[PDB]
Structure formats: C-alpha cells, structure tokens
Design a protein around this motif. Structure first.
Motif, PDB file in Angstrom:
ATOM      1  N   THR A 166       2.216  12.632 -14.416  1.00 44.73           N
ATOM      2  CA  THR A 166       1.867  11.263 -14.783  1.00 44.73           C
ATOM      3  C   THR A 166       2.980  10.297 -14.383  1.00 44.73           C
ATOM      4  OG1 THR A 166       0.514  11.980 -16.684  1.00 44.73           O
ATOM      5  CG2 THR A 166       1.267   9.689 -16.670  1.00 44.73           C
ATOM      6  N   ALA A 167       4.228  10.728 -14.542  1.00 47.79           N
ATOM      7  CA  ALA A 167       5.369   9.905 -14.160  1.00 47.79           C
ATOM      8  C   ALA A 167       5.403   9.717 -12.645  1.00 47.79           C
ATOM      9  CB  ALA A 167       6.670  10.532 -14.653  1.00 47.79           C
ATOM     10  N   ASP A 168       5.087  10.780 -11.915  1.00 47.59           N
ATOM     11  CA  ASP A 168       5.055  10.719 -10.461  1.00 47.59           C
ATOM     12  C   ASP A 168       3.938   9.793  -9.996  1.00 47.59           C
ATOM     13  OD1 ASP A 168       7.140  12.474 -10.509  1.00 47.59           O
ATOM     14  OD2 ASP A 168       5.976  14.241  -9.931  1.00 47.59           O
ATOM     15  N   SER A 169       2.789   9.878 -10.657  1.00 48.04           N
ATOM     16  CA  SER A 169       1.671   8.993 -10.356  1.00 48.04           C
ATOM     17  C   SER A 169       2.035   7.546 -10.637  1.00 48.04           C
ATOM     18  CB  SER A 169       0.452   9.401 -11.168  1.00 48.04           C
ATOM     19  OG  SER A 169       0.050  10.691 -10.751  1.00 48.04           O
ATOM     20  N   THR A 170       2.776   7.351 -11.715  1.00 46.30           N
ATOM     21  CA  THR A 170       3.209   6.023 -12.101  1.00 46.30           C
ATOM     22  C   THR A 170       4.119   5.446 -11.029  1.00 46.30           C
ATOM     23  OG1 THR A 170       3.031   6.461 -14.478  1.00 46.30           O
ATOM     24  CG2 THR A 170       4.486   4.662 -13.789  1.00 46.30           C
ATOM     25  N   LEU A 171       5.071   6.247 -10.561  1.00 48.49           N
ATOM     26  CA  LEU A 171       5.968   5.807  -9.495  1.00 48.49           C
ATOM     27  C   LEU A 171       5.198   5.528  -8.205  1.00 48.49           C
ATOM     28  CD1 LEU A 171       9.065   5.313  -9.353  1.00 48.49           C
ATOM     29  CD2 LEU A 171       8.219   6.410 -11.443  1.00 48.49           C
ATOM     30  N   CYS A 172       4.203   6.359  -7.915  1.00 53.26           N
ATOM     31  CA  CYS A 172       3.372   6.164  -6.733  1.00 53.26           C
ATOM     32  C   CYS A 172       2.699   4.795  -6.787  1.00 53.26           C
ATOM     33  CB  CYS A 172       2.319   7.271  -6.633  1.00 53.26           C
ATOM     34  SG  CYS A 172       1.348   7.252  -5.109  1.00 53.26           S
ATOM     35  N   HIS A 173       2.146   4.463  -7.922  1.00 56.89           N
ATOM     36  CA  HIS A 173       1.533   3.195  -8.135  1.00 56.89           C
ATOM     37  C   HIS A 173       2.475   2.053  -7.995  1.00 56.89           C
ATOM     38  CE1 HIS A 173      -2.002   5.038 -10.299  1.00 56.89           C
ATOM     39  NE2 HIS A 173      -2.478   4.467  -9.246  1.00 56.89           N
ATOM     40  N   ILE A 174       3.639   2.145  -8.596  1.00 49.11           N
ATOM     41  CA  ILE A 174       4.673   1.128  -8.492  1.00 49.11           C
ATOM     42  C   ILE A 174       5.041   0.917  -7.030  1.00 49.11           C
ATOM     43  CG2 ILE A 174       7.084   0.593  -8.979  1.00 49.11           C
ATOM     44  CD1 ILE A 174       6.662   2.151 -11.659  1.00 49.11           C
ATOM     45  N   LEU A 175       5.254   2.016  -6.315  1.00 54.30           N
ATOM     46  CA  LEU A 175       5.638   1.947  -4.911  1.00 54.30           C
ATOM     47  C   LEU A 175       4.505   1.406  -4.041  1.00 54.30           C
ATOM     48  CD1 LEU A 175       7.751   5.204  -4.460  1.00 54.30           C
ATOM     49  CD2 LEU A 175       8.552   2.836  -4.504  1.00 54.30           C
ATOM     50  N   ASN A 176       3.266   1.708  -4.417  1.00 55.37           N
ATOM     51  CA  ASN A 176       2.112   1.188  -3.691  1.00 55.37           C
ATOM     52  C   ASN A 176       2.018  -0.332  -3.827  1.00 55.37           C
ATOM     53  OD1 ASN A 176       0.747   3.262  -2.234  1.00 55.37           O
ATOM     54  ND2 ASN A 176      -0.017   4.131  -4.158  1.00 55.37           N
ATOM     55  N   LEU A 177       2.433  -0.856  -4.976  1.00 61.37           N
ATOM     56  CA  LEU A 177       2.436  -2.300  -5.187  1.00 61.37           C
ATOM     57  C   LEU A 177       3.561  -2.972  -4.397  1.00 61.37           C
ATOM     58  CD1 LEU A 177       1.677  -2.569  -9.002  1.00 61.37           C
ATOM     59  CD2 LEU A 177       0.142  -3.087  -7.092  1.00 61.37           C
ATOM     60  N   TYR A 178       4.771  -2.437  -4.520  1.00 61.08           N
ATOM     61  CA  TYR A 178       5.938  -3.011  -3.853  1.00 61.08           C
ATOM     62  C   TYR A 178       5.886  -2.864  -2.336  1.00 61.08           C
ATOM     63  CZ  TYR A 178       8.780  -4.393  -7.838  1.00 61.08           C
ATOM     64  OH  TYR A 178       9.282  -5.042  -8.944  1.00 61.08           O
ATOM     65  N   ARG A 179       5.327  -1.754  -1.864  1.00 59.86           N
ATOM     66  CA  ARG A 179       5.294  -1.459  -0.436  1.00 59.86           C
ATOM     67  C   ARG A 179       3.917  -1.739   0.176  1.00 59.86           C
ATOM     68  NH1 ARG A 179       8.837  -2.994   1.042  1.00 59.86           N
ATOM     69  NH2 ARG A 179       8.383  -1.974   3.047  1.00 59.86           N
ATOM     70  N   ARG A 180       2.928  -1.986  -0.680  1.00 58.77           N
ATOM     71  CA  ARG A 180       1.573  -2.323  -0.239  1.00 58.77           C
ATOM     72  C   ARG A 180       0.969  -1.238   0.653  1.00 58.77           C
ATOM     73  NH1 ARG A 180       0.692  -7.736  -1.838  1.00 58.77           N
ATOM     74  NH2 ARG A 180      -1.399  -7.560  -0.927  1.00 58.77           N
ATOM     75  N   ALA A 181       1.401   0.002   0.447  1.00 59.02           N
ATOM     76  CA  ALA A 181       1.007   1.112   1.309  1.00 59.02           C
ATOM     77  C   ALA A 181      -0.495   1.400   1.257  1.00 59.02           C
ATOM     78  CB  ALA A 181       1.793   2.362   0.936  1.00 59.02           C
ATOM     79  N   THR A 182      -1.056   1.427   0.054  1.00 59.25           N
ATOM     80  CA  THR A 182      -2.473   1.741  -0.115  1.00 59.25           C
ATOM     81  C   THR A 182      -3.348   0.660   0.517  1.00 59.25           C
ATOM     82  OG1 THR A 182      -2.206   3.089  -2.125  1.00 59.25           O
ATOM     83  CG2 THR A 182      -4.356   2.049  -1.781  1.00 59.25           C
ATOM     84  N   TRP A 183      -2.958  -0.597   0.333  1.00 52.90           N
ATOM     85  CA  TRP A 183      -3.695  -1.722   0.896  1.00 52.90           C
ATOM     86  C   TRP A 183      -3.594  -1.768   2.416  1.00 52.90           C
ATOM     87  CZ3 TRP A 183      -0.929  -4.968  -3.301  1.00 52.90           C
ATOM     88  CH2 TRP A 183      -1.622  -4.833  -4.509  1.00 52.90           C
ATOM     89  N   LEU A 184      -2.433  -1.398   2.949  1.00 53.08           N
ATOM     90  CA  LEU A 184      -2.237  -1.376   4.393  1.00 53.08           C
ATOM     91  C   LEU A 184      -3.123  -0.314   5.039  1.00 53.08           C
ATOM     92  CD1 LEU A 184       1.616  -1.843   4.361  1.00 53.08           C
ATOM     93  CD2 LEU A 184       0.000  -3.406   5.469  1.00 53.08           C
ATOM     94  N   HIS A 185      -3.257   0.827   4.371  1.00 50.72           N
ATOM     95  CA  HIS A 185      -4.141   1.888   4.839  1.00 50.72           C
ATOM     96  C   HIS A 185      -5.595   1.425   4.792  1.00 50.72           C
ATOM     97  CE1 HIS A 185      -6.620   5.617   3.995  1.00 50.72           C
ATOM     98  NE2 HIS A 185      -6.119   5.860   5.193  1.00 50.72           N
ATOM     99  N   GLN A 186      -5.972   0.813   3.675  1.00 47.08           N
ATOM    100  CA  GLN A 186      -7.311   0.259   3.498  1.00 47.08           C
ATOM    101  C   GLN A 186      -7.656  -0.699   4.638  1.00 47.08           C
ATOM    102  OE1 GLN A 186      -7.846  -1.648  -0.322  1.00 47.08           O
ATOM    103  NE2 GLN A 186      -9.856  -2.489   0.212  1.00 47.08           N
ATOM    104  N   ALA A 187      -6.705  -1.557   4.998  1.00 42.63           N
ATOM    105  CA  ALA A 187      -6.917  -2.546   6.053  1.00 42.63           C
ATOM    106  C   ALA A 187      -7.142  -1.880   7.407  1.00 42.63           C
ATOM    107  CB  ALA A 187      -5.735  -3.509   6.126  1.00 42.63           C
TER     108      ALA A 187
END
Ligand code: NAD
Ligand code: NAD
Ligand code: PPY
Ligand code: PPY
Ligand code: CA
Ligand code: CA
Lengths: 328, 328
Positions: free
Chosen positions: A103-124
């Motif tokens: 859960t902590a790792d998932s939390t960090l993943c989410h935080i990093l996805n927001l700061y780095r916009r990685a998930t959104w960049l992939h989506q695009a």
C-alpha cells in the motif's frame, strides 16, 4: 462439531482450508450483501471471513444466530458495526500488517505519477499524441514539478503512513504529519515534523496523502471547508478510505484548478467508474480500483493470518485467544 | 562583434537572453535538421545551442563555417559526432546535472508502475472496466508483485543511476549494478553490490533499469542474445537512450512473456508512437515521450547553465574556460 465458517464476500477458500480443515466446516457465499446469504449460513455460521466489499449493519448482524467471530481479511473494518457486533456477542478481528508496504509502494507510485505525470503521458500516447519538440514535451508534461524541497503532508501516521514517510524522505520530500491519536514523540523517533491541527497540515503541504482509518469523526475529512485550507495547486492522494473525501468538493476543486491533481485508489462508492459520479468530468485525475494492497504474497499472507485467527477462536476461548480483536 | 549564437532545434531563447544579451547576437532556427537551417546561420554562427531532437554528423558539422562551440542543453550528446566536431575545431559541451533527480524520480515512477500496475489499472478504468470483487481485483492486478527482497539491476551507475539506487533501497530493493568504466570502490561507498559482467547483472536481476550513456560499444546492449540472459518474467526500464535496446527483441520477449513488462521513456525512433514500429502490438508496455527530465525548475536550470557555458566560450578562451567540454 466442526462448526461452520463462512467466507461471505468471496468464492475461493483454498488458502484458508489447510489451516481450518480439521476444526471447521468451510463454505463460501460469494455475496455482496446479506440478502444473498443462505438461511443455513445465517442460522449456523459460528465464524465468518470477509473482505471490504460487504457491509454489516446491526440489522445485518442480527440475522446471524450462531455467529461468534468475524475476521476481516484486511486491516480496515469500517464496513462493520463492530460496536453492535460486540454487544451481540460477536468478536471482530482484522489483519493489521495486511499489505503495509504494498500500500505504501502504491501510495508512492501515485505521488510520483502526479509529480511526474507519467500515467497521463502514457494515456496521451495511447490516444495518438506525437511529441516531437522540446517545446511540445514541456507543454504535454506541463504541471510536472521538482520533488526535492516539496512538503508531503501525511494524515494518519500509522503503519502505512510511516512506511510512506520513510520512502518519501528518499526523494527529498519534507515530511509533515497530523495524527491526533498518537502519543508524544513518534515524530522524533522517525525524524518527522508533527503539526497539531488538520488546518496546519493542509496549509503547509504541497501534496496531501491520507492514511487514517475511517471512523465516527472523520467522514468527509476533506470537504468544501478544508479543501479551501489546502495550498493552491496542491496534490491529493488517497489509498485509505473513500468516505474520507467529499468527491463533490474534490471535483469542483479539480475543475477550478485549486487542486492540480488527485490520485485515488478508494472512493465513496465502489466499485469506481469514470462514467458514474461527481468525478465523471473532473480533470487531472488518477484512479485505481482499490488495488493498492495487492500482491500475490500479500493476498496469501493476510488470508493465512485470518484463518489462523479463526482457528484460535474455535480451538480456544473468545476473546482471550485472539491476536487482533478490535472490539474488546 | 556580438557573435551569432543559434538555438538549432528550438524556438524560445528567453531564458538564455539575460545571460548572453551583451556578448552575443541570439537567434533560433526551430530546425529538426540542418536542411532547415539558414545559410546565414550556417555561415556566421560562432556558437550553437541544441537539445536532443537534432543530430549532427560530420557532414552536418562541415556546413558550419564559423562554429567554434556547441552546447547541449542536457547531459546526453550521442546525437553529435563530437570526435569529428573536435577535429573541425568545434568544442562540444553538455549540462551533466541536467535533471538528475527528475530523471531518477521518473525512473522510480516507472519501476513502481510496473510492480504495482498502477498506470495499467487506470487505463483499464478509463476503458470502462468495473472491479467489484476481490477476485476481480486480483485478476485485473495480476502481475503485481511485492517489492521487498526483489533485486534491481542498474546498468550504468552514474549520476542518475546512483540517485535511483538510493531511492530503490528505501523500498526494500536489493540493488546490484554493472558499470565497467567505474573505478574500484564506489560499491562500498554507496552500499551496493557490483557485478563484473552484463550477464551477471541480467542473471540476478528481477528488474533491469538502464542509466548508461549511448556510446560506440553499447548500441543494442539489450538484444536477442542478452534478453535470453534475463530472468523469466523480468521487468525492463529505460530512461537512458532508445538506441540501447533492440525493440524487435523486446517486442518478441513481451509477447512471449519472457519479459513481464517494460517501461520506456526513450525509443529507437523518436518521437514515439504506439501505432508505428515493433512495439505496436506489444503487450505490458508503458511509454512516455522522453519527459523523464522535465520540471519547470530543471528546464530553466539547464538552459541557464548552457548559456553560461556559451558566455564563457565567447568571453574567454576555448577550451580552457569551459566547464563541461566533453571532447577535449
Ligand atoms: N487501498 C488499500 O488497498 C488499502 C490497503 C491497506 C490499508 N488501507 C487503508 O489505509 C488506512 C491506514 O491503514 P494502516 O494499516 O496504516 O492503519 P493503522 O491503524 O496502522 O493507522 C491508522 C492511523 O491513522 C490515524 N488516524 C485515525 N483517524 C485520524 C484523523 N481523523 N486524523 C489523523 N489521523 C487519524 C490513527 O491515529 C492511526 O495512527 C486504513 O484506513 C486502511 O483501511 C487501504
Ligand atoms: N530521458 C531523459 O529525459 C533523460 C534525462 C537525463 C539523462 N538521460 C540519459 O540517461 C543516461 C545517464 O545519464 P547520467 O547523467 O547518469 O550520465 P552519467 O555520465 O552521470 O552516467 C553514465 C554512466 O553509465 C556508465 N556506462 C556507460 N556505458 C556503459 C555500459 N555499456 N555498461 C554499463 N555502464 C555504462 C558510465 O560508466 C557512467 O558511470 C544518459 O545516457 C542520458 O542521455 C535521459
Ligand atoms: O483495504 C484494506 O483495508 C486492506 O487491508 C487491503 C485489502 C483489500 C482487499 C482485500 C484484502 C485486503
Ligand atoms: O535526455 C537528456 O540527456 C537530458 O539531459 C534531458 C533533456 C531532455 C530534453 C531537453 C533537455 C534535457
Ligand atoms: Ca506547487
Ligand atoms: Ca518475478
């Protein structure tokens, strides 16, 4: 006697069987609610195993005529009226080490996805976007922010919150936390900064992440009022419980840009859908289907612990033999 | 004299101007190639600023009649024949602290996206998936793995590699690295395990992450041969250079499940498209458009450093006054 033990909101009992084979008749109900449970189970079940997908009110609990113990396969037990359960002579237990680091790792993943916009960049890119120039890269990644020196506010510094804090420091986050139920000193032990009020937390935090249990006093902890106390362009992450956030206020915040982005693994109404609810047309949103907890090892572990708790109850005395009873 | 300084593959020189205003005539070409550059710039440019999107072969370099210095706004300079540049009397410099921690954070985001399947879970929800039961959660999150005790193999333990290693340890990763150009001892200084061969790295690593420069001796470092040396169901992450990986071999590996997932911010041919190339129909893939480096602060920083390097060249003597010349 081989008392009946029922898995309420599941269909698979394979992990549990080797631990209960000799002391219990084990069955499953694959039920989303008590309406779906057979009278035989309601009448005869002495023990029950359940996840987070079914809720037990006092009315639901009253339907159980022989139930002596409920074990949540997981840490959160907000889906059970444990007080009424105890009044009805029903012990309720959980599995507290359930997926702490997952859960902590998932939390960090989410935080990093927001700061780095990685998930959104992939989506695009999936959508067909072509990013040729440096100018285009900056535009499409607009909102991405440097992490070092940023302040991460943790609400609830328990097992997951602590795991998150330690990881966060490795990225250069300044870590603050608000947890009114903790005793003096944990902040010194872990090298963190503590604040005394939720407003203080929200006021000084660039990114807010929730890690508190859902209880009588924090439903919609994040609301129209407290969102206004959050920094402009702040991030929000929630892997705790959906009930902690008023998704109406969050939607409006995202649209107005008051909140730059949100990452949610839990929601007010689960299962979640991007087509149903206040968050339907809300921008800058990441969502996962309550899977922060999941790994094969974690799933097996918590099920094994839950079965052992059931076994301790049947083979011993309630609640003295119980490891993790949360309603003594 | 106010010598001409040209931004080749860009259109914005605002950050650079305050640093060069008094010592250089500054222009931009917004060119993807030398064909697009005006004869005036080719004839008169004494200094050049460029990103990664344009490549300069010896033939391209020979078109420049007055060029004395090229400064890469960024760390990687594989897109310039620096040897020929130097032979032609052209100093080439870079910005080595360019986005070190941004890139490391992006790398961790990618690693976490693979282990936690966060990006894919979001994608699935966007597609309409409903995840109601715990059984469904496990199925859709199938492949998600516990991180503690896993071995992360780093190829290239430079600035980014080191930043990644430190972060990785905070998650419980066992960190190994392979870097044949480093001197004895760094492994002790940073508390890491070093291996002497690429095969050793690949053989012991659950997740492989690339952080080496692209040079004469590691094109397609990851190929049909070396992929076979990778553990079964291994992860691959690449935020270094696309040329390091034979995307044909990677595609086949992903399809066959030999590699469980890959996360790429760089590619053999950029800009990247999910519709064009070997990776077109490859599964378990995350991709971002060479944005691992990006944050507003980082972008400004490297541009300011690059301009200062240009200024040092014009105001001083080449190459003695240069801070980051990589072709002495
Ligand atoms: N999404 C998932 O898959 C997943 C997985 C595990 C846990 N969780 C959830 O995450 C939460 C944290 O789990 P945990 O194992 O750390 O629990 P925990 O009991 O170890 O930690 C809870 C902490 O929150 C604090 N807290 C409670 N109410 C608060 C409030 N109003 N303000 C500030 N702090 C408050 C408590 O003092 C406690 O220290 C739980 O609610 C659990 O349901 C979700
Ligand atoms: N995607 C992005 O936005 C982005 C951002 C920054 C850097 N990068 C890339 O990441 C890479 C690393 O950058 P850095 O700042 O750490 O560079 P660096 O020079 O600090 O580190 C490079 C390291 O790689 C090692 N190396 C070189 N060839 C190798 C090989 N064949 N096997 C093993 N190790 C090898 C070197 O010994 C060196 O220690 C660069 O190639 C750069 O182009 C990408
Ligand atoms: O959500 C929780 O409280 C957990 O502990 C994680 C979890 C989720 C689903 C099944 C089992 C455990
Ligand atoms: O890719 C690199 O080598 C970098 O240093 C990052 C970068 C990318 C694009 C523009 C400037 C710097
Ligand atoms: Ca901010
Ligand atoms: Ca594995």
């Amino acid at each position: 006697h081989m008392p009946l033990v029922a898995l309420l909101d599941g269909r698979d009992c394979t992990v549990e069987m080797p631990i209960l084979k000799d002391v219990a008749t084990v069955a499953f109900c694959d039920a989303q609610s008590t309406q779906e449970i057979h009278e035989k189970v309601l009448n005869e079940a002495v023990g029950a195993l359940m996840y987070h997908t079914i809720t037990l009110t006092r009315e639901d609990l009253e339907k159980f005529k022989a139930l002596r113990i409920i074990v949540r396969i997981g840490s959160g037990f907000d889906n059970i009226d444990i007080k009424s359960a105890g009044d009805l002579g029903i012990a309720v237990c959980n599995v507290p080490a359930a997926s702490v680091e997952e859960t902590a790792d998932s939390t960090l993943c989410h935080i990093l996805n927001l700061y780095r916009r990685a998930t959104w960049l992939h989506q695009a890119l999936r959508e067909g976007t072509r990013v040729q120039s440096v100018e285009q890269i900056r535009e499409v990644a607009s909102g991405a922010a440097r992490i070092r020196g940023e302040t991460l506010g943790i609400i609830g510094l328990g097992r997951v919150g602590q795991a998150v804090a330690l990881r966060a420091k490795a990225f250069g986050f300044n870590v603050l936390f608000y947890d009114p139920y903790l005793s003096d000193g944990v902040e010194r032990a872990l090298g963190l900064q503590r604040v005394s009020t939720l407003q203080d937390l929200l006021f000084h935090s660039d990114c807010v992440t929730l890690h508190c249990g859902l209880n009588e006093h924090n439903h919609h902890l994040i609301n129209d009022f407290t969102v206004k106390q959050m920094r402009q362009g702040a991030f929000l992450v929630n892997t705790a419980r959906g009930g902690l956030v008023d998704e109406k206020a969050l939607a409006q915040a995202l649209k107005e840009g008051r909140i730059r982005g949100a990452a949610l693994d839990v929601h007010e109404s689960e299962p979640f859908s991007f087509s149903q609810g206040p968050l339907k047309d809300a921008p800058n949103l990441i969502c996962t289907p309550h899977a922060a907890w999941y790994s094969e090892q974690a799933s097996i572990e918590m099920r094994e612990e839950a079965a052992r708790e059931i076994r301790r109850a049947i083979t011993g005395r309630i609640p003295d033999s119980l490891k993790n009873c949360v309603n003594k």
